[PDB]
Design a protein around this ligand. Sequence first.
Ligand SMILES: Nc1ncnc2c1ncn2[C@@H]1O[C@H](COP(=O)(O)CP(=O)(O)OP(=O)(O)O)[C@@H](O)[C@H]1O
Ligand SMILES: CC(C)C(=O)C(=O)O
Length: 585
Amino acid sequence: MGRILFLTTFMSKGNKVVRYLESLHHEVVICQEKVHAQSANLQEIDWIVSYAYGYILDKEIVSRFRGRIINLHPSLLPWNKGRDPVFWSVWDETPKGVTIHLIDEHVDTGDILVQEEIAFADEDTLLDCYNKANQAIEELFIREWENIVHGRIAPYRQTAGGTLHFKADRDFYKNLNMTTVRELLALKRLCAEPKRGEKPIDKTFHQLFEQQVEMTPDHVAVVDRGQSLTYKQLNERANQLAHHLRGKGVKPDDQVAIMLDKSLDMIVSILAVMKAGGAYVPIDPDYPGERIAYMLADSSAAILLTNALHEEKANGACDIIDVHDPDSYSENTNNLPHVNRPDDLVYVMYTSGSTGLAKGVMIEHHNLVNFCEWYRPYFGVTPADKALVYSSFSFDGSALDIFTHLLAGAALHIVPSERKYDLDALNDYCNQEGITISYLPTGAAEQFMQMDNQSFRVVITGGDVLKKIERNGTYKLYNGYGMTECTIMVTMFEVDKPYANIPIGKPIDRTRILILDEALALQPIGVAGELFIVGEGLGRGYLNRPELTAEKFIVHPQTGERMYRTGDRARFLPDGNIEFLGRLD
Ligand SMILES: Nc1ncnc2c1ncn2[C@@H]1O[C@H](COP(=O)(O)CP(=O)(O)OP(=O)(O)O)[C@@H](O)[C@H]1O
Ligand SMILES: CC(C)C(=O)C(=O)O
């Protein structure tokens, strides 16, 4: 009949298409490589049929064979042009079908000959989809071939729009081939990029705090033993000190060290540093003098807010400002002119030097603002609540204590030394004062479940594996995961039942968790892998450690996004909650 060139790389040589064409007495030449005009495979060729051909025909060839190049593309063109059509058909959630079209001067854009719809079952695998489509289009070709040879089909131009994909676009999804349709789309919801319409955070913390002061100025803000400050009182005193600081040269991104024991002066100092424009570097005064001397040096802190008691532990490291000297406070009680942006430093905390020397973790305002903006509505915090300043102010767990509740109008209650380790005593305080919400490390939180409590409405815990769930009170328990580098915490779970492994929940606001293999490629739901963090949580990095910063804050090779690699193992559950599975090594 005629000699037909059959171009293809992925399909076999005994296709139902080739056999059918052969059955009509056509000599079918099978070529699976790029060719040129001189190729002996283009000799006496009546028709060219391409089917999953991974190369481009030269324009010289397309011109000579105009109207005689027929392509089998398993998609509903213009949807899913290019490579991996069936896969992106499912992922991008586009219309589905198979198209037999003419080949023109571009990628899968030529006019259509025949096209029909196709359906994939929710429980079909992507491989099943790939095969169901290849079989459908092969049958369509056999059915409509005669109509195409006699050129009685009027080719119609493709609808406007569609999508296009390239060979490498599927690299990130290389492990999803044996996944189910609905199992794949589930993974899409959990890990797909942010939706449209989002705007960057436009507020700093002290900006929002000054707002909260105007709303609840006379409400109690912080308590320590018998003494207390209201939102206005606290705000005015912090301004007085902030004015003095900014007058001593404090500028945005400057680090100011604070060295105090838990007290009202600590809260004033922290805010005062913020309002002045700097970022506070907390230094526990009980730390060994070695750590203190090193923290003060590695940090660029030119100023140190401290007592006269702990003044000598600096060994003259920097300019001292006595929080108890009236000369350290200005007359001006008014808020200062704003000079910060959400991407300015807000605080710098050092991780315990378990491995190697301690590193200074930088955190920006937008990092802290996002956490508090999520914390308030998630736990329904109102000015009626009262929370504990439990954790050492050198740990990011203290940021949860102080900063979240202050923006909700609640009241902070400083936890002194005598009721830090003695949790039974701390329990009585909570019932006395009516403490309603606080965060307790996994350890202390587990012991506190023994005590009888009627005050707490909610308690949050995290930092280690939360094995024990039984507790006497009536309050909700929450498990939270995260590290200092991504601001306090990134996921939250409400503990409703007991669990063998207790999940760490779903991501907070404007954060995304990805479970990746050793090649940084997505892992299907239920498969373990290194947990990666993306979004508003990621801080600036490690202070004066750019090489180490780049090691942990990566630019992904495929999606090009900035992610923090935790070094933790985890796996998604079918209901969206995350399961922690210990460290990597
Ligand atoms: N709810 C949780 N369950 C289990 N592991 C958790 C967890 N929350 C956090 N983790 C893990 O345990 C660590 C606790 O946080 P960080 O104290 O900031 C790290 P570190 O200071 O290097 O060591 P450390 O955990 O020995 O204190 C996190 O880095 C994380 O890997
Ligand atoms: C201190 C709190 C926020 C914590 O879970 C952590 O840092 O791991």
